[PDB]
């Protein structure tokens, strides 16, 4: 197919709830090596989010079954083996996405908003890998996830105003990363408070007809601060 | 592979909980092919697995079919929806043919009681019906006939061997009536069949029992639901 045909196939697959088809189509689009439009990059993201999300959900279900008392060691081993099967599927998906990001999407991105989008995507899929990793690989995937978020964070801070909704909320997602993945609540609070306060300082500059674009995310930052500071 | 029957059944149960129905169906296909008669539990795992597997493809086929009835002035988008519908169709037909082969080679001939024979002949009617929903040309008349014949064979046994309130006999009447309504475009016969089965059940309320009361009355209401809808049409 050509690019426009692949995008139409992706949209058909989405309507049919056939997300593996949708991801395959948008992977093929990405491999043509050109910068994606806003619409195309959202189709890619939605496709793989649904594909990986199904495996993440199945993994949690089987992991919980495995964490319940089973005296029959043969049955215990059957659950472990099935969990590992799902794990390998999940890791294959994440590595496919990470390879698309490292070979095509991040290197070809010529504008800050694109760059931040794909770096945050990279952080997400390393995070997913970290959820199922063990030992030294868990530390490595967590560190790779953090590095990607941090790079997106620094670009957003350099290129966007403190009230920009992409910047806010990259800040929100990053602060939650510190709270939940790194178990670092003091830093989580610090990040969220800096982003909240710096946006608050510029409420002056927003239009009365559009300020909610910013304040909706700022309220989410503030809600997390209330919870976290009360412990 | 190296998994034995107890491992396959446990994997089917784990796949069900993880909503991985393709895995569930594969496990129960492997169990079936070992040649022992499926237990009641195994039969229900097999049926649930393939119902979910085929149901996803049937739903996708309906969605794309309906999209393809949007007269795209560009033949490109029309040909693209047709090709994708045909891809889903072939997937759907592969699933149905797998089930029908299991029924023909293992499930029907290994059934040693009437209830199971009726269950599997009904299932054969169901999967030829799903094929009939997407078939065309000379393949369509074959598929329709094979669906009707399977339902008729199931109905003959069920009328001889099962009480009119038995949930399997009621569910067979339900699906056979849907066959007439949807496949043969015969709502008058669909209603006649459903009305007769409903009335045969209420003529013998003494044959209800505690174990299947909820199942029986659920399907009786489904028969009534179709009757009211089809009559208002």
Model description:
The PDB classes it as protein transport. The entry lists the keywords ChREBP, transcription activation, protein transport. It forms a dimeric assembly. Two copies of one chain form a homodimer. With 231 residues, the first copy, chain A, is an all-alpha fold. The first copy, chain A, has one domain (1-231): Delta-Endotoxin, domain 1, CATH 1.20.190.20. Helices cover 79% and strands 0% of the residues of chain A. Chain A contains nine helices and no strands. In chain A, helix 2 crosses helix 3, helix 3 (38-66) runs antiparallel to helix 4 (73-108) and helix 5 packs antiparallel against helix 6 (136-159). Chain A is globular and about 65 Å long. Chain A binds chain B through residues 5, 8-9, 12-13, 15-18, 54, 57-58, 61-62, 65, 74-75, 78-79, 82, 86, and chain B through 6-7, 10-11, 14-15, 17-20, 56, 59-60, 63-64, 67, 76-77, 80-81, 84, 88.
Please give the count of helices of chain A: 9
Largest sheet properties of chain A: none
Q: Quick one: how many beta strands of chain A?
A: 0
CATH architecture of chain A: Up-down Bundle
Look at the structure and give the CATH class of chain A. Mainly Alpha
The two chains with the largest interface, and their residue counts, are: A-B, 21 and 22 residues
Q: Which radius of gyration of chain A do the C-alpha atoms yield?
A: 20 Å
Q: How many domains in all of chain A?
A: 1
- Helix-strand pattern of chain A: HHHHHHHHH
Q: What separation lies between the terminal Cα atoms of chain A?
A: 54 Å
Structural class given helices, strands, pairing of chain A?
Answer: mainly alpha
What is the beta-strand fraction of chain A?
under 5%
- Oligomer status: homodimer
CATH superfamily of chain A: 14-3-3 domain
- What name is given to the CATH topology of chain A? Delta-Endotoxin, domain 1
Pfam families (chain B): 14-3-3 (PF00244)
Keywords (chain B): Acetylation, Cytoplasm, Isopeptide bond, Nitration, Phosphoprotein, Ubl conjugation
Protein name (chain B): 14-3-3 protein beta/alpha
Modified residues (N6-acetyllysine) (chain B): 5, 51, 70, 117
